[PDB]
C-alpha cells in the first residue's frame, strides 16, 4: 500500500544505508538471508517472492566498486538483489563535475530504470529516501542529477534526503564547499525536504551524552539509522497518531525555498546512566530542545523556531506530552517566529526504539525525535558561502571542474542562489 | 578493475622499483616465484591493479624495466624477485648515458623508447580500467631523467586523461653524487613541470638524517632508503588497494592536493618511525603518528616547511583508527600551527583512512605536503645551474648531442617562473 524506495549514494549513503537496513532487519525480525523465522508495514519497505524471501526495496550506487563490494562480500549479500547493487569503475574524485555530469551520465539511466521498476512493483508510492554525503563528489553531483531526473519523472512523489552537512572546524576534503554549494543549488531547485546532520555535533553528542570513547562512523550511522527508523517507524507501526511523509512536507515547509529540518534525538545515554536517569516525556523533550543535543553544530538560540515536528515511540501518553509541550511553550529561551501561532505536530508510536546487539546505546521504553527549522542553519550557510568565497576568490581547484565540463557561470549562479537563500532566511526571520 | 602501470627508469628507478615490488609482493603475500601464499581474500580481491593473471595462476607484476645500462637489470634478474617479471618487459639497449640528459633523451634512448611504448600499449590493452602510470626515477641521471622524461611525454601524449605521477630523487643541497646535475635537474624539471600531474621530491640526505637520527642506525645502505620510499608508495597504493573509510582514489588525491595545475610538487613523509628498543617507550595512537608526520625532521625532501605555507596537505592512515582522533588532531594541529597554512584555503587537510595496516604495525600513516620550500629547492637548483651555465661548463657535451642552448635558457625561464609562482602564493 504505502511504500517508499530508499536510495544510497556514496560511501556515506551506502554505510548509513547498511546500518539503516540492518536496523530494519532487527526491527522486523528479518535475518540476512531474507527470512523471518501484523508487521506488513514491513511489506511497505520489503517486497516478497514465492519462497517467502523478503528483500529490501533500495538502490545502492557507488561510482567506484569499493564499499559496494564490501556489501557484496558482506553478510547481507544474501539479502539485497544483485541488480540493486550498482558499481562503476571509478569515483567522482570529490569533483561535482564528474558525478553530476561526466561519470554518472553513463550510469544514472540504469539506476533510474531500476528505481522505476522498483516503483512499478509498488501498490502505492509515498516517496523516496536519498542518503548521501554533502560535499562528497559522488553524492553531491550524482544525487543532484538523480534528484533532478527523479523530480522530472515522478512529479509530486515525495522526495526526502538525509545529507551529511560539512562541519565548520573539521573537513575530510578541501573542495567540500564547491560541491556543497553546487549541490544545494541544483538540489534546492528540486528536493522537497532535506535533513541536515553534522558529524562533529554527533561526535560531541555521543561523547558527552553517551559517555563513550572516541567512536567511528559505525555508531554514527547507527544513530542516523535510529532517527530514520524512528520516522519510518512512525509510518511502519500502528500508534495513537500515525503520520504520512506528506504531512512532514506539509508542516516542515512553510515556504518552498526553505526546507532544512534539523534532527535531534533523545534520550541518548549510557546503559549505566540509564539506571539513575528517570525517563519522562517532559525531560526527553527538554533534552530534545537542548542546543547541545542537536545533531548539527549550529546554535539554535541565534535564530527562531519556524516549524517543529516531534515523533514519539514506545510508551507515550499524549496527556503529559501536551503538558510537556506547554511547559516548553512557556520557556522564552526557546523563541518561535512571530507570525506562527503554533509550529508543533506530535506523532505517537507504540513500538519502542529497539537496540542493536553490540550497540552502544542504552535500552529505553520511550524516545523522541525532533524535526525542526531554524535560521542558525542560515548562519551555517553563511560560513559555507564564506569559505567558498575565499577559495573561489582565489580560483583554487577550479581547473578540475572546468576541464571536466563545469562553467564559472554555474559557480557564480550557485553563489547568487546561496545569497538569495541567506536573504530568504533573513526575510522570513523577520 | 582500476590498474596502474609502473615504469621503472634505469638504475635507481629499477632498484627502488625492485624494493617497491618486494614490498608489494609482501603486501599481497606473493611468493617471488609468482605463487600466492597469502592468507586472505583481500590479498587477491582487487590485486589485478598491480598484477596479471597467468594461465598457471602465477601473478606477474605489471611493470616495465627500462635502462641503457643493463647491468642493473642484470642484477635485478639475478635478484630473488627477478623471476616475477617476464623477460618480455625487460627493455634495454647497451650504451652509457654518461649522465647526459640530451644523449639519453634525444639520441640513444629514443632508439629504445618505441619498444617500451609497445610494451606499455600491451599492458594498457590488458588493462580493464586504467587509472594511470607511475614512474620511479632520478633527477641528475642521464637515463632516468632523459628516458623518464621522454617516456612521460610520450605516455601523456598517448594517455592525456590518465593519471601520471613520478617519484623522483632530487639533488642534495650540500653534497652531490655527480657533476652537471643542475642541467639534468633543470631540463627534467621543465619537462616535468609541464608534462606530469604530480611528482614526489625525495633527497637522500633527508633520508640519511631521518634514518640515522630517528631509527638510530649504523651501516645500512640504499636498500633501506628505497624500502622507506616504497613504504610510502605502498601506503598511498594501500589506500587504493584496500577497503576503509574515506577511501582515496589517486586522482582524488591529485585533485585535493593541487589547487594550481603548475604547482603539483609534494613532500612525502611516513609514520610511525622508531628505532629498535626505543619503540617500547612509545605508544601507538593517531596523535603520535600525526606528531611524527608534521615533524619537519621527518620530511623525506630536503627542505624546512617552517619557511613557507601549506597550500594543501593529505594525511593517509592505515590500520584500525578512530576517526575522532584524526579529526581532533588535524583540527588542533591546523589550529596551533596557523600561519603555517595558507589563509584563503580553509581546511587544508585531506583525510583518508585504510583499515589494513602495514605488516608488523598496528597502525601507520603517510604525509603528503605542498609547500614553497620546494621553491627553495628550485632556488638552489636554479642557482647552481646558473653558476655552471654562466661559464658554459660541460655545455659542449649537450651541444655535441644536439642540445640547443635556448632550451637551457627556456628551462631556466620556466623554473624561474615556477619558483616565482611559488612565491606568488604565500
Ligand atoms: N556520518 C557519516 N559521514 C560519512 C560517512 N562516510 C563518509 N561520510 C562523509 O563523506 C565525506 C567524504 O566524502 P564521501 O561521501 O566518502 O565521497 P564518496 O562517497 O567516496 O564519493 P567520491 O567523492 O567520488 O569519492 C566526509 O566528509 C564525511 O562527512 C559515514 O560513514 N558516516
Ligand atoms: N634513493 C636512492 N637513490 C639513488 C640510488 N642509486 C642512485 N641514487 C641517486 O641517483 C644519483 C646518481 O644518478 P644515476 O641514476 O646513477 O645517473 P644515471 O646513470 O644517468 O641514471 C645520485 O645522486 C643518487 O642520489 C638508490 O639505490 N637509492
Ligand atoms: Mg566514493
PDB file of N, CA and C in Angstrom, chain A residues 222-254:
ATOM      1  N   UNK A 222      24.650   4.278  12.915  1.00  0.00           N
ATOM      2  CA  UNK A 222      23.612   3.637  13.724  1.00  0.00           C
ATOM      3  C   UNK A 222      22.639   4.662  14.314  1.00  0.00           C
ATOM      4  N   UNK A 223      23.166   5.778  14.813  1.00  0.00           N
ATOM      5  CA  UNK A 223      22.317   6.844  15.347  1.00  0.00           C
ATOM      6  C   UNK A 223      21.429   7.430  14.248  1.00  0.00           C
ATOM      7  N   UNK A 224      22.050   7.789  13.127  1.00  0.00           N
ATOM      8  CA  UNK A 224      21.288   8.281  11.979  1.00  0.00           C
ATOM      9  C   UNK A 224      20.220   7.254  11.598  1.00  0.00           C
ATOM     10  N   UNK A 225      20.628   5.990  11.603  1.00  0.00           N
ATOM     11  CA  UNK A 225      19.732   4.879  11.317  1.00  0.00           C
ATOM     12  C   UNK A 225      18.587   4.831  12.319  1.00  0.00           C
ATOM     13  N   UNK A 226      18.891   5.113  13.583  1.00  0.00           N
ATOM     14  CA  UNK A 226      17.862   5.147  14.616  1.00  0.00           C
ATOM     15  C   UNK A 226      16.841   6.237  14.307  1.00  0.00           C
ATOM     16  N   UNK A 227      17.331   7.428  13.975  1.00  0.00           N
ATOM     17  CA  UNK A 227      16.440   8.529  13.594  1.00  0.00           C
ATOM     18  C   UNK A 227      15.531   8.148  12.416  1.00  0.00           C
ATOM     19  N   UNK A 228      16.159   7.734  11.317  1.00  0.00           N
ATOM     20  CA  UNK A 228      15.417   7.338  10.123  1.00  0.00           C
ATOM     21  C   UNK A 228      14.401   6.248  10.456  1.00  0.00           C
ATOM     22  N   UNK A 229      14.848   5.261  11.225  1.00  0.00           N
ATOM     23  CA  UNK A 229      13.989   4.155  11.620  1.00  0.00           C
ATOM     24  C   UNK A 229      12.831   4.665  12.462  1.00  0.00           C
ATOM     25  N   UNK A 230      13.086   5.668  13.298  1.00  0.00           N
ATOM     26  CA  UNK A 230      12.023   6.259  14.108  1.00  0.00           C
ATOM     27  C   UNK A 230      10.961   6.899  13.220  1.00  0.00           C
ATOM     28  N   UNK A 231      11.403   7.670  12.230  1.00  0.00           N
ATOM     29  CA  UNK A 231      10.468   8.225  11.244  1.00  0.00           C
ATOM     30  C   UNK A 231       9.645   7.108  10.578  1.00  0.00           C
ATOM     31  N   UNK A 232      10.354   6.229   9.878  1.00  0.00           N
ATOM     32  CA  UNK A 232       9.691   5.137   9.184  1.00  0.00           C
ATOM     33  C   UNK A 232       8.863   4.315  10.166  1.00  0.00           C
ATOM     34  N   UNK A 233       9.267   4.300  11.436  1.00  0.00           N
ATOM     35  CA  UNK A 233       8.516   3.591  12.473  1.00  0.00           C
ATOM     36  C   UNK A 233       7.212   4.315  12.751  1.00  0.00           C
ATOM     37  N   UNK A 234       7.261   5.644  12.740  1.00  0.00           N
ATOM     38  CA  UNK A 234       6.038   6.432  12.787  1.00  0.00           C
ATOM     39  C   UNK A 234       5.142   5.952  11.662  1.00  0.00           C
ATOM     40  N   UNK A 235       5.746   5.701  10.504  1.00  0.00           N
ATOM     41  CA  UNK A 235       4.983   5.111   9.393  1.00  0.00           C
ATOM     42  C   UNK A 235       4.768   3.587   9.459  1.00  0.00           C
ATOM     43  N   UNK A 236       5.660   2.856  10.125  1.00  0.00           N
ATOM     44  CA  UNK A 236       5.697   1.392   9.996  1.00  0.00           C
ATOM     45  C   UNK A 236       4.943   0.636  11.087  1.00  0.00           C
ATOM     46  N   UNK A 237       4.295   1.353  11.996  1.00  0.00           N
ATOM     47  CA  UNK A 237       3.540   0.697  13.059  1.00  0.00           C
ATOM     48  C   UNK A 237       2.303   1.503  13.415  1.00  0.00           C
ATOM     49  N   UNK A 238       1.325   0.835  14.019  1.00  0.00           N
ATOM     50  CA  UNK A 238       0.075   1.487  14.377  1.00  0.00           C
ATOM     51  C   UNK A 238       0.158   2.019  15.798  1.00  0.00           C
ATOM     52  N   UNK A 239       0.227   3.341  15.910  1.00  0.00           N
ATOM     53  CA  UNK A 239       0.256   4.014  17.195  1.00  0.00           C
ATOM     54  C   UNK A 239      -1.046   4.745  17.440  1.00  0.00           C
ATOM     55  N   UNK A 240      -1.016   5.704  18.357  1.00  0.00           N
ATOM     56  CA  UNK A 240      -2.175   6.549  18.609  1.00  0.00           C
ATOM     57  C   UNK A 240      -2.335   7.549  17.472  1.00  0.00           C
ATOM     58  N   UNK A 241      -1.211   8.102  17.022  1.00  0.00           N
ATOM     59  CA  UNK A 241      -1.195   9.052  15.916  1.00  0.00           C
ATOM     60  C   UNK A 241      -0.165   8.644  14.868  1.00  0.00           C
ATOM     61  N   UNK A 242      -0.646   8.282  13.682  1.00  0.00           N
ATOM     62  CA  UNK A 242       0.222   7.895  12.574  1.00  0.00           C
ATOM     63  C   UNK A 242       0.416   9.058  11.608  1.00  0.00           C
ATOM     64  N   UNK A 243       1.628   9.186  11.074  1.00  0.00           N
ATOM     65  CA  UNK A 243       1.996  10.342  10.257  1.00  0.00           C
ATOM     66  C   UNK A 243       2.529   9.946   8.882  1.00  0.00           C
ATOM     67  N   UNK A 244       1.963  10.562   7.848  1.00  0.00           N
ATOM     68  CA  UNK A 244       2.424  10.380   6.474  1.00  0.00           C
ATOM     69  C   UNK A 244       3.522  11.389   6.144  1.00  0.00           C
ATOM     70  N   UNK A 245       4.485  10.976   5.324  1.00  0.00           N
ATOM     71  CA  UNK A 245       5.594  11.843   4.921  1.00  0.00           C
ATOM     72  C   UNK A 245       5.094  13.160   4.321  1.00  0.00           C
ATOM     73  N   UNK A 246       3.956  13.084   3.638  1.00  0.00           N
ATOM     74  CA  UNK A 246       3.331  14.264   3.055  1.00  0.00           C
ATOM     75  C   UNK A 246       3.005  15.281   4.145  1.00  0.00           C
ATOM     76  N   UNK A 247       2.747  14.789   5.353  1.00  0.00           N
ATOM     77  CA  UNK A 247       2.460  15.663   6.483  1.00  0.00           C
ATOM     78  C   UNK A 247       3.739  16.338   6.965  1.00  0.00           C
ATOM     79  N   UNK A 248       4.860  15.624   6.886  1.00  0.00           N
ATOM     80  CA  UNK A 248       6.153  16.227   7.185  1.00  0.00           C
ATOM     81  C   UNK A 248       6.410  17.340   6.184  1.00  0.00           C
ATOM     82  N   UNK A 249       6.159  17.050   4.910  1.00  0.00           N
ATOM     83  CA  UNK A 249       6.251  18.080   3.877  1.00  0.00           C
ATOM     84  C   UNK A 249       5.337  19.256   4.199  1.00  0.00           C
ATOM     85  N   UNK A 250       4.097  18.948   4.564  1.00  0.00           N
ATOM     86  CA  UNK A 250       3.101  19.969   4.869  1.00  0.00           C
ATOM     87  C   UNK A 250       3.533  20.874   6.020  1.00  0.00           C
ATOM     88  N   UNK A 251       3.960  20.265   7.121  1.00  0.00           N
ATOM     89  CA  UNK A 251       4.276  21.007   8.336  1.00  0.00           C
ATOM     90  C   UNK A 251       5.650  21.675   8.328  1.00  0.00           C
ATOM     91  N   UNK A 252       6.658  20.979   7.808  1.00  0.00           N
ATOM     92  CA  UNK A 252       8.038  21.454   7.907  1.00  0.00           C
ATOM     93  C   UNK A 252       8.447  22.393   6.772  1.00  0.00           C
ATOM     94  N   UNK A 253       7.524  22.675   5.856  1.00  0.00           N
ATOM     95  CA  UNK A 253       7.821  23.530   4.709  1.00  0.00           C
ATOM     96  C   UNK A 253       6.789  24.651   4.574  1.00  0.00           C
ATOM     97  N   UNK A 254       6.935  25.714   5.383  1.00  0.00           N
ATOM     98  CA  UNK A 254       6.044  26.873   5.264  1.00  0.00           C
ATOM     99  C   UNK A 254       6.285  27.638   3.967  1.00  0.00           C
TER     100      UNK A 254
END
